[PDB]
Paper text:
The structure of SMURF2 in complex with Cpd-8 demonstrated binding of the same cryptic cavity as the SMURF1-inhibitor complex. However, in contrast to SMURF1, inhibitor binding did not elongate the SMURF2 αH10, and the invariant glycine (G628) stems the hinge in both the inhibitor-bound and -unbound forms. SMURF1 R686 is conserved in SMURF2 as R680, but SMURF1 D636 is replaced with G630 in SMURF2, meaning that the network of non-covalent bonds stabilizing the elongated αH10 in SMURF1 cannot be formed in SMURF2. Consistent with this, SMURF2 was not inhibited by Cpd-8. The resistance of SMURF2 to inhibition is likely conferred by G630, which, in the presence of compound, does not form the bond network required to lock the elongated αH10. However, the G630D SMURF2 was susceptible to inhibition by Cpd-8.
The structure of SMURF1 is typical of a NEDD4 subfamily member, with a N-terminal C2 domain for cellular membrane localization, WW domains for target recognition, and a catalytic HECT domain that binds E2 and mediates target ubiquitylation through a surface-protruding catalytic cysteine. At the cellular level, SMURF1 acts as a negative regulator of bone morphogenetic protein (BMP) signaling, which modulates cell migration, proliferation, and apoptosis. Ubiquitin transfer requires a motion facilitated by a flexible hinge that connects the HECT domain N- and C-lobes. To gain structural insights into the mechanism of selective inhibition, we crystallized the HECT domains of both SMURF1 and SMURF2, without and with a representative SMURF1 inhibitor, compound-8 (Cpd-8), and determined structures at 2.05–2.75 Å resolution.
Author numbering: 369 to 741
Write the structure that this text describes.
């Protein structure tokens, strides 16, 4: 933990130097067209403009203070640009929670400029210390942060290919594997023969060159069909965050930064929760924590996402939980409502509204029904 905290202090220090002393990054956009209007304004700016202090205004709105409006625009846009509606990203069919690049994004001919823009925004979130659980896989984040893709990463991407490549590396393939440095794949009904390296079609894979074959294969498979999109996103990102500044961080550290604590702890959660219209020793609070304690990691993540908008636990735990404006502890609010209603969430204030359920079993079932699907 200490090593990571120190690297993050060094990173923040180096990034503050990149920020010009004078000038501002001025953005004026409507909330209703946040994506498109931010796209137009950010893409007219040079990379050096993106490092300047943010001066943001929402169209037709006065705003309380610039710092707060900048925090709100960056949070809202970073989440909005991930919406499948804009044609850049989509949820995996196999893994319903995983966000990935849409391989058919080219239906919008300007798609590359849009991915460049998203990269700039992800860079700007890093620059202003925002930790966003976008939903991408860890190897997606590692590629963006300049880390090499490993054969280990292929396990979940393509399990059969992973076993085959591990087999190539670990065993003598001579006279069993009959392959060359050319891979074939079916893209949109046509078989593409792709050479991993020059003259690939005429180079057989053998004991001497199999390590290079597996490395090139892993790189190609990982970005297959999304090469241009990923390159535009990386280019936008590297215009805000220099690659050299991240070389110090290892894979494990990157995982903790983007996804937060590896487990949702019910003890840390309950001692950092605010109570409204219920007391510490009440039945409703006792039954709520008894349900959360029974909940497994999956159910606790569903509960945290339901109440806060994210299943990411900050590295400092629940005492560091944040809402819309800034710091907002998780809140249990006992409401005066019909006990057949499900619990209601207000993700802005990390708050859950609970009717006065008559028994633990009733609270348990209603909470489970509310966090389903
Ligand atoms: C190595 C040190 O890393 C950092 O300092 C650091 C900070 C401050 N934030 C981030 C981070 O959260 N992401 C990385 C791009 C994820 C992310 C951001 C914006 C997004 C998004 C996902 O989905 C859409 O908008 C990192 C890694």
């Amino acid at each position: 933990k200490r090593d990571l905290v120190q690297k993050l202090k060094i990173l923040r220090q180096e990034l503050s130097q990149q920020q010009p002393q004078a000038g501002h990054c001025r953005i004026e956009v409507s909330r209703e067209e946040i994506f498109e209007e931010s796209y137009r304004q950010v893409m007219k700016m040079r990379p050096k403009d993106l490092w300047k202090r943010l001066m943001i205004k929402f169209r037709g709105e006065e705003g309380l203070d610039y710092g707060g409006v900048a925090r709100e625009w960056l949070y809202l846009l970073s989440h909005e640009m991930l919406n499948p509606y804009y044609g850049l990203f989509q949820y995996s069919r196999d893994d319903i929670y995983t966000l990935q690049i849409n391989p058919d994004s080219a239906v919008n001919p300007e798609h590359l400029s849009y991915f460049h823009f998203v990269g700039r925004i992800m860079g700007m979130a890093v620059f202003h210390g925002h930790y966003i659980d976008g939903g991408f896989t860890l190897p997606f984040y590692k590629q963006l942060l300049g880390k090499s893709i490993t054969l280990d990463d292929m396990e979940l991407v393509d399990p059969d290919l992973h076993n085959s490549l591990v087999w190539i590396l670990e065993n003598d393939i001579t006279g069993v594997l009959d392959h060359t440095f050319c891979v074939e794949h079916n893209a949109y009904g046509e078989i593409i023969q792709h050479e991993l390296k020059p003259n690939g079609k005429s180079i057989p894979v053998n004991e001497e060159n199999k390590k290079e074959y597996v490395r090139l294969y892993v790189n190609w498979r990982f970005l297959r069909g999304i090469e241009a999109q990923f390159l535009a996103l990386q280019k936008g990102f590297n215009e805000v965050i220099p690659q050299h500044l991240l070389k110090t961080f290892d894979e494990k550290e990157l995982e903790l930064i983007i996804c937060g604590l590896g487990k949702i702890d019910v003890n840390d959660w309950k001692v950092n929760t605010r109570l409204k219209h219920c007391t510490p020793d009440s039945n409703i609070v006792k039954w709520f924590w008894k349900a959360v304690e029974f909940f497994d990691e999956e159910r606790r993540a569903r509960l945290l996402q339901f109440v806060t908008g994210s299943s990411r636990v900050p590295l400092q735990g629940f005492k560091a939980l944040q809402g819309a404006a800034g710091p907002r502890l998780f809140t249990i609010h006992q409401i005066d409502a019909c006990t057949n209603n499900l619990p209601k969430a207000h993700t802005c204030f990390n708050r859950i509204d609970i009717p006065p359920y008559e028994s633990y079993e009733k609270l348990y079932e209603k909470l489970l029904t509310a966090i389903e699907e």
